[PDB]
Amino acid sequence: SMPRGADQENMLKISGYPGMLNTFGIAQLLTPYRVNGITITGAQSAVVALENKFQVYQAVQDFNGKKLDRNHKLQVSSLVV
């Protein structure tokens, strides 16, 4: 799942993807960002460890509000805020 000794500044919160995705599929959703761990927190929500805070900020810009289909829209935010 998640590396035990991670820093919260590298973490991304992501929700709204289709519940069918497993943890590998969540990493696939975020290609090409390096993903170091994923914790599933809900039916359609997870926390994802990226490389550093610059990756987190760019991932937020790239994916937040993105429409996946008619019934799914991504909510993406930095864990540390």
Add this chain to the structure above:
Amino acid sequence: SMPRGADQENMLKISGYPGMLNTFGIAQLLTPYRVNGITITGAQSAVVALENKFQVYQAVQDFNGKKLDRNHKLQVSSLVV
């Protein structure tokens, strides 16, 4: 990690990617195929569990020989011959 009850007929062998990829990055290589598990077998090799034999066959067609950069090209095959 790799589920214990997985069948080798649903599995592919993948090698030649940059050794700096982790298990999540190997799944990202294979987007959008559903990945159910991954076992690292070497510095630049792994075994990946897909959904069924059709996915294994199409993943081989799609990814075998793919050039990632000047020094890296993928070798992809069915685990069982």
